[PDB]
Each structure stands twice: as C-alpha cells, then as structure tokens.
Amino acid sequence: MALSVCEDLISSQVYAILVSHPPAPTDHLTPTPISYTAGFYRIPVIGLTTR
Amino acid sequence: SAHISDAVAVVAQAIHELFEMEQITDPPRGCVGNTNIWKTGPLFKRVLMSS
Amino acid sequence: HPNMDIAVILVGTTEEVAIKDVHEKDDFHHLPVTPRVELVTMQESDPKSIITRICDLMSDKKVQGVVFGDDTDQEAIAQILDFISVQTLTPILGIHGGSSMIMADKEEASMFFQFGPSIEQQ
Amino acid sequence: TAASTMLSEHNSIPQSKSSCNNIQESRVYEAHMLKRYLINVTFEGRDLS
Ligand SMILES: *[C@@H]1O[C@H](CO)[C@@H](O[C@@H]2O[C@H](CO)[C@@H](O)[C@H](O)[C@H]2NC(C)=O)[C@H](O)[C@H]1NC(C)=O
Ligand SMILES: *[C@@H]1O[C@H](CO)[C@@H](O[C@@H]2O[C@H](CO)[C@@H](O)[C@H](O)[C@H]2NC(C)=O)[C@H](O)[C@H]1NC(C)=O
C-alpha cells in the first residue's frame, strides 16, 4: 500500500488520491498509511469508506 | 459505487475550480532525489474543501 | 555469543565519522549484554528510500533496535517512521532533526521514541 | 538499560527477526511488555525517561 505509493502512486504524479475499505477487512483503519504517505507531499487524500 | 460517482464528481468540480487559480508547480517526480515539499497542494485542499 | 543486535543511521549533510566510533569505544562501557552495531548513512533520505534501507538492513543485521538521525528540517519523516513502527514492531528512536520534531500522540500499539518536547511541557 | 532489564525481568533475549516481508514473529508480541523497560531507561544518572 505505501510502496504502491512512492513508485506506483507518485511516479505518475497524481493530484489526489482516493481510498476505500478492502473487500476483506483486517482489524481497523486500513487506510492509515496513505494519509501519511500522500501527506508528506501534501497530496490531498479522499476516503470513501473510512468513517 | 454511489459514493464513487459522487466523490469523483466533487473532485472534478474541485479541480476545475482549482485551476481557476494560478502559478502552480507540478508535484515532485518520483520519490527519489526530492527532500523538499511541494508548494502546490495545500491550495488544492482549500478549494476542494470549499467545493 | 550473548549480544543484542542494533542499528543506527545518519542522514543529510552532517557527518558522524569518528564521533560514532568514539561512542562505540565509549559504548562498550560496563554491561553483560554487548551491543552489536551496524552503521549505514544515506546522503539522501526519502519515504521510499528510508523505508527501503532499514528493512534491507533488517535482512543482514536482523537488529532488535534502530536509531535514526538526520540533518533535515522536515517534520513528515518522523510520521513515516511511526508507520514503520506500526509495520515491524521494532523499537526506533531519534536524536536529532525531523525524528526529534513534535508529533501526533503515538498510537498505543506503535512503539517509538523521539527527542521532541511535549506541547504541554512547553 | 532496556537490555539490562531484559537481563533482570525475564532472563530472556530481546533479539527478534527483523523482516517486514516475512510474517511478524509471534514472540514479537512479548516485546510489548518489554516497552515498559524501554520506557524506563536511564544512564549516566540521567533520565531518558
Ligand atoms: C448502488 O449504487 C449504484 C450506482 O449509483 C446504483 O445503481 C443505480 O441505480 C439507479 C436507481 O435510480 C439507476 O438510475 C442507475 O442507472 C444505476 N446505476 C448508476 C446510477 O449508474 C444502485 O441502485 C445502488 N444500490 C442500491 C441498492 O440502491
Ligand atoms: C525504573 O527502574 C528503577 C530500577 O529498577 C526503579 O527504581 C526502583 O523502584 C522500586 C520500586 O518497586 C524500588 O523498590 C527500588 O529500590 C528502586 N531501585 C532499585 C531497584 O534499587 C524505578 O521505580 C523505575 N521507575 C518507574 C517504574 O517509574
């Protein structure tokens, strides 16, 4: 998920990222890393399913 | 799916409202070699929150 | 025989050099368990680079603790490291720079030490 | 000093497999109790607490 961000989600220069809960869920707050990862570059993140 | 369509709609409105703004630097190309933040981006958040 | 495995890293323009060696000389001190140290430095620190290097170092060092240090003025690096603590459950702390800066109250599960004064304390 | 308390509290080696890619060691769990010793760290008559 985060490594998918530095090369996968940042090599391409996204202006923003969307994030949603996975089909199979483990524990809670799965979309913690992205908010941090995009956050370093201040890339806006929008969650769909994270209440 | 219901949120996806809407979230992306909002993102689109936010961006189109955003580019009305000016003098924006592209985000850093790739993680490698950049220790510096991106001046552009906080602003994207500001317009996007006020969509 | 009976020594703990440890790693420390320095980043940015500043160079530790001989001082680190002196600390090791200073470090033997008095103790029953001895520290085993592997040192690596990186001219450049990145979320992908930093994330990559410490785990890569995990492969050979298999260290039970890490200290991070930087020449940098960037706040975000410490947060990434908090994520890493969450990811690997290995203690990490930092003595300078970004790792030192004040950060969000540590998630209880995460393990982490930074040399940053608390807002309340200030 | 954390290691000093590894000697005192449980006589147990703190050493653990470091790889993120590999499944986290079950005995990594124990480190949680280890954190208190970690929290209570002092040297040179000076508190790192
Ligand atoms: C889940 O969301 C999808 C997509 O919004 C819904 O599918 C739409 O249903 C409306 C009903 O008015 C149709 O007009 C659309 O043609 C459908 N697809 C779209 C909007 O592209 C679906 O109904 C939703 N699920 C439930 C149970 O309501
Ligand atoms: C940090 O550790 C030190 C040493 O283990 C603790 O100091 C001891 O506290 C106990 C209280 O049960 C006393 O009985 C000992 O006399 C103290 N020193 C010794 C063992 O000689 C100290 O309390 C710890 N700090 C904490 C837990 O806040």
Curated annotation (Swiss-Prot), chain A:
Heterotetramer; the NMDAR subunits are modular and harbor tiered domains that function in concert to regulate opening and closing of the cation-selective ion channel pore. Forms heterotetrameric channels composed of two GluN1/zeta subunits (GRIN1), and two identical GluN2/epsilon subunits (GRIN2A, GRIN2B, GRIN2C or GRIN2D) or GluN3 subunits (GRIN3A or GRIN3B) (in vitro). Does not form functional channels by itself. Component of N-methyl-D-aspartate (NMDA) receptors (NMDARs) that function as heterotetrameric, ligand-gated cation channels with high calcium permeability and voltage-dependent block by Mg(2+). NMDARs participate in synaptic plasticity. Channel activation requires binding of the neurotransmitter L-glutamate to the GluN2 subunit, glycine binding to the GluN1 subunit, plus membrane depolarization to eliminate channel inhibition by Mg(2+). NMDARs mediate simultaneously the potasium efflux and the influx of calcium and sodium. It is found in: Cell membrane; Postsynaptic cell membrane; Postsynaptic density membrane; Synaptic cell membrane. Belongs to the glutamate-gated ion channel (TC 1.A.10.1) family. NR1/GRIN1 subfamily. The lineage of its organism: Eukaryota, Metazoa, Chordata, Craniata, Vertebrata. It comes from Xenopus laevis. A hydrophobic region that gives rise to the prediction of a transmembrane span does not cross the membrane, but is part of a discontinuously helical region that dips into the membrane and is probably part of the pore and of the selectivity filter. The extracellular N-terminal domain (NTD) is a site of allosteric regulation to modulate overall receptor function. This is Glutamate receptor ionotropic, NMDA 1.
From Swiss-Prot, chain C:
Detected in oocytes. Zn(2+) binds at residue 96. Coiled coil: none annotated. It is found in: Cell membrane; Postsynaptic cell membrane. It comes from the Eukaryota. A hydrophobic region that gives rise to the prediction of a transmembrane span does not cross the membrane, but is part of a discontinuously helical region that dips into the membrane and is probably part of the pore and of the selectivity filter. Component of N-methyl-D-aspartate (NMDA) receptors (NMDARs) that function as heterotetrameric, ligand-gated cation channels with high calcium permeability and voltage-dependent block by Mg(2+). Channel activation requires binding of the neurotransmitter L-glutamate to the GluN2 subunit, glycine binding to the GluN1 subunit, plus membrane depolarization to eliminate channel inhibition by Mg(2+). NMDARs mediate simultaneously the potasium efflux and the influx of calcium and sodium. Heterotetramer. Forms heterotetrameric channels composed of two GluN1/zeta subunits (GRIN1), and two identical GluN2/epsilon subunits (GRIN2A, GRIN2B, GRIN2C or GRIN2D) or GluN3 subunits (GRIN3A or GRIN3B) (in vitro). In vivo, the subunit composition may depend on the expression levels of the different subunits. Belongs to the glutamate-gated ion channel (TC 1.A.10.1) family. NR2B/GRIN2B subfamily. This is Glutamate receptor ionotropic, NMDA 2B. The gene is grin2b. The chain holds residues 27 to 148 of 1448 of the full protein.
